[PDB]
Amino acid sequence: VLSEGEWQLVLHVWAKVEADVAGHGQDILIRLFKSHPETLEKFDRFKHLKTEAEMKASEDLKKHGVTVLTALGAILKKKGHHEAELKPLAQSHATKHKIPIKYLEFISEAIIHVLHSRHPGDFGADAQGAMNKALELFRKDIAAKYKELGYQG
Numbered sequence: 774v775l776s777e778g779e780w781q782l783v784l785h786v787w788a789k790v791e792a793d794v795a796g797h798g799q800d801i802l803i804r805l806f807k808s809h810p811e812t813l814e815k816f817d818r819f820k821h822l823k824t825e826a827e828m829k830a831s832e833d834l835k836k837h838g839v840t841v842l843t844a845l846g847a848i849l850k851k852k853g854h855h856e857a858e859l860k861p862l863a864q865s866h867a868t869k870h871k872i873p874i875k876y877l878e879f880i881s882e883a884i885i886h887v888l889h890s891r892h893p894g895d896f897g898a899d900a901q902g903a904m905n906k907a908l909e910l911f912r913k914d915i916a917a918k919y920k921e922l923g924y925q926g
Protein backbone atom coordinates (compact mmCIF):
# COMPACT_ATOMS: atom_id res chain seq x y z
CA VAL A 774 0.00 0.00 0.00
CA LEU A 775 1.45 3.39 -0.94
CA SER A 776 1.45 6.15 1.63
CA GLU A 777 -0.14 9.50 0.92
CA GLY A 778 3.32 11.00 0.54
CA GLU A 779 4.24 8.35 -2.03
CA TRP A 780 1.05 9.00 -4.00
CA GLN A 781 1.84 12.72 -4.01
CA LEU A 782 5.25 12.01 -5.54
CA VAL A 783 3.64 9.76 -8.18
CA LEU A 784 0.93 12.23 -9.16
CA HIS A 785 3.23 15.21 -9.05
CA VAL A 786 5.39 13.73 -11.78
CA TRP A 787 2.35 12.39 -13.62
CA ALA A 788 0.94 15.94 -13.83
CA LYS A 789 4.12 16.80 -15.76
CA VAL A 790 3.52 13.90 -18.17
CA GLU A 791 0.12 15.15 -19.03
CA ALA A 792 1.63 18.21 -20.64
CA ASP A 793 2.74 16.03 -23.57
CA VAL A 794 0.94 12.75 -23.24
CA ALA A 795 1.62 11.80 -26.88
CA GLY A 796 5.42 12.41 -26.75
CA HIS A 797 5.69 10.38 -23.58
CA GLY A 798 3.60 7.56 -25.10
CA GLN A 799 5.90 7.43 -28.21
CA ASP A 800 9.05 7.38 -26.10
CA ILE A 801 7.67 4.70 -23.83
CA LEU A 802 6.42 2.35 -26.55
CA ILE A 803 9.57 2.79 -28.59
CA ARG A 804 11.73 2.02 -25.56
CA LEU A 805 9.59 -1.03 -24.79
CA PHE A 806 9.87 -2.33 -28.40
CA LYS A 807 13.63 -1.67 -28.62
CA SER A 808 14.55 -3.05 -25.23
CA HIS A 809 12.19 -6.08 -25.49
CA PRO A 810 11.44 -6.92 -29.15
CA GLU A 811 9.15 -9.81 -28.17
CA THR A 812 6.66 -7.08 -27.05
CA LEU A 813 6.40 -5.59 -30.56
CA GLU A 814 5.48 -8.98 -31.90
CA LYS A 815 2.29 -8.88 -29.77
CA PHE A 816 1.01 -5.96 -31.85
CA ASP A 817 -0.28 -6.90 -35.29
CA ARG A 818 -0.97 -3.20 -35.49
CA PHE A 819 2.79 -2.28 -35.19
CA LYS A 820 4.93 -5.25 -36.07
CA HIS A 821 5.65 -3.89 -39.58
CA LEU A 822 7.85 -1.25 -37.91
CA LYS A 823 11.49 -2.28 -38.20
CA THR A 824 13.49 0.87 -37.21
CA GLU A 825 13.26 3.49 -34.50
CA ALA A 826 12.74 6.16 -37.21
CA GLU A 827 9.77 4.24 -38.59
CA MET A 828 8.35 3.95 -35.08
CA LYS A 829 8.80 7.70 -34.48
CA ALA A 830 7.08 8.45 -37.81
CA SER A 831 3.99 6.32 -37.07
CA GLU A 832 0.96 8.43 -36.17
CA ASP A 833 -0.98 5.33 -35.24
CA LEU A 834 1.77 4.35 -32.71
CA LYS A 835 1.52 7.89 -31.27
CA LYS A 836 -2.24 7.50 -30.99
CA HIS A 837 -1.90 4.21 -29.17
CA GLY A 838 0.66 5.71 -26.80
CA VAL A 839 -2.01 8.23 -25.78
CA THR A 840 -4.55 5.40 -25.28
CA VAL A 841 -2.13 3.56 -23.02
CA LEU A 842 -1.04 6.54 -20.95
CA THR A 843 -4.61 7.84 -20.54
CA ALA A 844 -5.67 4.46 -19.09
CA LEU A 845 -2.62 4.41 -16.79
CA GLY A 846 -3.18 8.01 -15.63
CA ALA A 847 -6.81 7.21 -14.73
CA ILE A 848 -5.53 4.22 -12.67
CA LEU A 849 -2.83 6.22 -10.89
CA LYS A 850 -5.27 8.99 -9.98
CA LYS A 851 -7.40 6.37 -8.10
CA LYS A 852 -4.45 5.88 -5.68
CA GLY A 853 -4.97 2.15 -5.44
CA HIS A 854 -8.81 2.23 -5.54
CA HIS A 855 -8.65 1.09 -9.13
CA GLU A 856 -10.71 -2.14 -9.30
CA ALA A 857 -13.18 -0.81 -11.88
CA GLU A 858 -10.32 0.22 -14.12
CA LEU A 859 -8.30 -2.98 -13.92
CA LYS A 860 -11.11 -5.45 -14.61
CA PRO A 861 -11.46 -4.72 -18.24
CA LEU A 862 -7.74 -4.09 -18.78
CA ALA A 863 -6.75 -7.38 -17.15
CA GLN A 864 -9.49 -9.18 -19.08
CA SER A 865 -8.39 -7.87 -22.46
CA HIS A 866 -4.70 -8.22 -21.74
CA ALA A 867 -4.92 -11.78 -20.47
CA THR A 868 -7.53 -13.21 -22.75
CA LYS A 869 -7.45 -11.22 -26.01
CA HIS A 870 -4.04 -9.59 -26.36
CA LYS A 871 -2.22 -12.43 -24.55
CA ILE A 872 0.28 -10.21 -22.73
CA PRO A 873 2.33 -11.95 -20.01
CA ILE A 874 2.65 -10.16 -16.67
CA LYS A 875 6.37 -10.03 -17.37
CA TYR A 876 5.70 -7.66 -20.30
CA LEU A 877 3.90 -5.33 -17.89
CA GLU A 878 7.11 -5.32 -15.92
CA PHE A 879 8.93 -4.31 -19.08
CA ILE A 880 6.64 -1.42 -19.86
CA SER A 881 6.87 -0.31 -16.21
CA GLU A 882 10.63 -0.06 -16.65
CA ALA A 883 10.14 1.93 -19.84
CA ILE A 884 7.72 4.35 -18.12
CA ILE A 885 10.18 4.94 -15.24
CA HIS A 886 13.05 5.51 -17.65
CA VAL A 887 11.15 8.04 -19.81
CA LEU A 888 9.85 9.93 -16.73
CA HIS A 889 13.40 10.15 -15.47
CA SER A 890 14.65 11.48 -18.80
CA ARG A 891 11.88 14.06 -19.18
CA HIS A 892 11.35 15.18 -15.55
CA PRO A 893 14.59 14.82 -13.60
CA GLY A 894 13.72 17.68 -11.15
CA ASP A 895 10.41 15.92 -10.26
CA PHE A 896 11.73 12.39 -10.54
CA GLY A 897 14.53 12.07 -8.04
CA ALA A 898 15.05 8.84 -6.20
CA ASP A 899 12.14 9.38 -3.81
CA ALA A 900 9.71 9.81 -6.70
CA GLN A 901 11.32 6.95 -8.65
CA GLY A 902 10.77 4.62 -5.70
CA ALA A 903 7.18 5.81 -5.26
CA MET A 904 6.40 5.33 -8.98
CA ASN A 905 8.00 1.90 -8.86
CA LYS A 906 5.67 1.07 -5.96
CA ALA A 907 2.64 2.36 -7.88
CA LEU A 908 3.54 0.30 -10.93
CA GLU A 909 4.16 -2.73 -8.76
CA LEU A 910 0.70 -2.31 -7.24
CA PHE A 911 -0.75 -2.13 -10.78
CA ARG A 912 1.06 -5.36 -11.70
CA LYS A 913 0.11 -7.12 -8.47
CA ASP A 914 -3.54 -6.37 -8.97
CA ILE A 915 -3.56 -7.25 -12.64
CA ALA A 916 -1.68 -10.49 -11.83
CA ALA A 917 -4.42 -11.51 -9.34
CA LYS A 918 -6.99 -11.13 -12.12
CA TYR A 919 -4.83 -13.05 -14.56
CA LYS A 920 -4.55 -15.86 -11.98
CA GLU A 921 -8.35 -15.92 -11.54
CA LEU A 922 -8.68 -16.38 -15.33
CA GLY A 923 -5.98 -19.02 -15.67
CA TYR A 924 -3.26 -16.83 -17.21
CA GLN A 925 -0.74 -15.98 -14.48
CA GLY A 926 1.50 -18.87 -15.59
Ligand code: HEM
Binds near residue numbers: 841842861
Ligand atom coordinates in the same frame (compact mmCIF):
# COMPACT_ATOMS: atom_id res chain seq x y z
C1 HEM B 1 0.83 0.32 -18.39
C2 HEM B 1 0.49 -0.77 -19.09
C3 HEM B 1 -0.58 -0.81 -20.13
C4 HEM B 1 -1.72 -0.12 -20.22
C5 HEM B 1 -2.31 0.91 -19.25
C6 HEM B 1 -2.35 -0.49 -21.45
C7 HEM B 1 -3.56 -0.02 -21.98
C8 HEM B 1 -4.21 -0.42 -23.09
C9 HEM B 1 -5.50 0.08 -23.55
C10 HEM B 1 -6.32 1.14 -22.81
C11 HEM B 1 -5.80 -0.54 -24.71
C12 HEM B 1 -7.09 -0.44 -25.52
C13 HEM B 1 -8.27 -1.17 -24.76
C14 HEM B 1 -8.01 -2.65 -24.51
O1 HEM B 1 -7.77 -3.42 -25.46
O2 HEM B 1 -7.94 -3.07 -23.31
C15 HEM B 1 -4.70 -1.47 -25.02
C16 HEM B 1 -4.54 -2.28 -26.13
C17 HEM B 1 -3.56 -3.18 -26.40
N1 HEM B 1 -2.44 -3.35 -25.60
FE1 HEM B 1 -2.15 -2.61 -23.72
N2 HEM B 1 -1.55 -1.45 -22.08
C18 HEM B 1 -0.46 -1.65 -21.29
C19 HEM B 1 0.51 -2.56 -21.58
C20 HEM B 1 0.69 -3.41 -22.68
C21 HEM B 1 1.85 -4.21 -23.00
C22 HEM B 1 3.10 -4.30 -22.19
C23 HEM B 1 1.57 -4.78 -24.19
C24 HEM B 1 2.41 -5.71 -25.09
C25 HEM B 1 3.64 -6.08 -24.82
C26 HEM B 1 0.24 -4.40 -24.62
C27 HEM B 1 -0.46 -4.78 -25.72
C28 HEM B 1 -1.66 -4.32 -26.21
C29 HEM B 1 -2.25 -4.75 -27.47
C30 HEM B 1 -1.72 -5.77 -28.44
C31 HEM B 1 -3.46 -3.97 -27.61
C32 HEM B 1 -4.36 -3.97 -28.81
C33 HEM B 1 -3.77 -2.95 -29.85
C34 HEM B 1 -4.62 -2.88 -31.11
O3 HEM B 1 -4.37 -3.78 -32.01
O4 HEM B 1 -5.49 -2.00 -31.19
N3 HEM B 1 -0.29 -3.56 -23.65
N4 HEM B 1 -3.75 -1.34 -24.01
